[PDB]
Amino acid sequence: NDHNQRNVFRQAITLNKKIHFQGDPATKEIISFHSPYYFDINEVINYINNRNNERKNKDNEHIWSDEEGNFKFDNENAHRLFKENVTPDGSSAGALNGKLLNFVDRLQSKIFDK
Amino acid sequence: NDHNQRNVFRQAITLNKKIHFQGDPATKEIISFHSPYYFDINEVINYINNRNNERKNKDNEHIWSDEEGNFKFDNENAHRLFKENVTPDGSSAGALNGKLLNFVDRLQSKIFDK
DNA sequence: CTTCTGATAAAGC
């Protein structure tokens, strides 16, 4: 039954592997969800908890804001959601607004399993 | 299909095991769900009943109010839900709000079974 | 107009 919980999990991990990748950009594009490269799990939880708090604008795109300024949520700007200190500016709730609150709690209460 | 119910059950027991622990803090942090430590079964129901009535604000964080004062549901303050006197306050219904009613009712049947 | 609530539905199993 999990669809919206599924792709946001795989998109967060796949994008975070390209952020922390320190090699040539030719093999950065071939990085996938199954590739064995380092990603921060705490930024992955922060990204999903951010997309939990999405707010789109009348033009139907999600507009965020961080300490450098307001930015559209797009492919080259999706790495900025890995930080906790982002506040959304929007007229209406986003596509996944309040839909991953159950998903983040299950994610956090599994990482801190000893 | 009970991942939300299984998560809050493991989360309530593991946290209640930590709170009732009276030993050294080094042992406290490695306390897990299987660890044979004392936990109040009635306090676990109170936390699950409270999280059944949780209310969140616009920032998608569950805000609570008790005798000590207003607080936000997080790992530092989630122990305050083991009391039944704490009341929710929020703009909208929480993640587990209304979704644990049968889960509590099934649990109290096992406890009150003679 | 947006938000929230509630109801209907579909799920997989």
- Residue B74, Cβ neighbours under 10 Å: how many? 10
Nearest alpha-carbon partner for B80 in B89, B91, B90, B69: B69
Q: How many angstroms is the resolution?
A: 2.8
Looking from the CA of A3 toward its CB, the CA atoms found within 13 Å total: 2
Q: How far apart are CA B33 and CA B12, in angstroms?
A: 9
Which protein residues have a C-beta closer than 7 A to any atom of strand C?
A 1, 55, 58, 90-93; B 1, 58, 91-93
Question: Cβ of B91: how many Cβ atoms within 10 Å?
Answer: 10
User: What is the DSSP secondary-structure string of B46-108?
Assistant: HHHHHHHT-EE-TTS-BEEE-SS-EEE-STTTGGGGGSS--EE--SEE-SSTTSSHHHHHHHH
Token pair listed for B87: 């009341």
Q: Write down how long chain A is.
A: 114
Residue B82 DSSP class: G
Distance CA B56, CA A53 (A): 12
The DSSP call for residue B10 is: H
Which letter does DSSP use for residue A33 in this model? T
Count of CB atoms within 10 A of residue B110's CB?
Answer: 8
A57: enclosing H helix or E strand: strand A55-57
| Closest nucleotide to A92: CA versus each C1' | C2
Token digits of residue B100: 């644990």
Helix, strand, coil share of chain B (percent; to 5): 45, 10, 45
Of B8, B32, B96, nearest to A114 by CB-CB distance is: B32
Helices (H), chain B: 3-19, 25-28, 41-52, 101-111
- In whole angstroms, what separates CA B80 from the centre of its chain? 8
| Technique used | cryo-EM
d(CA B90, CA B50): 13
Which chain C positions come under 7 Å from a protein C-beta? Answer: 1-6, 10-13
Å from the B87 CA to the C6 C1': 23
DSSP state of A113: -
Contact criterion met (CB below 8 Å) for B80 and B68: yes
Taking every pair of C-alpha atoms in chain B, what is the biggest distance, in angstroms? 45
Q: Is B14 exposed, middle or buried, given 0-12, 13-18 or 19+ CB atoms closer than 10 A?
A: buried
| Chain A: residues touching B (Cβ < 8 Å) | 1, 52-53, 97-98, 101-102, 105-106, 109, 113-114
Chain B residues whose beta carbon lies within 8 Å of the beta carbon of residue A113: 32-33
Distance CA B62, CA B104 (A): 20
CA B31 to chain centre: 16
Calculate the angstrom distance between C1' of C13 and CA of A2.
Answer: 14
Q: What's the rounded Cα separation, in Å, for the pair B114 and B102?
A: 20
First to last CA, chain B: 29
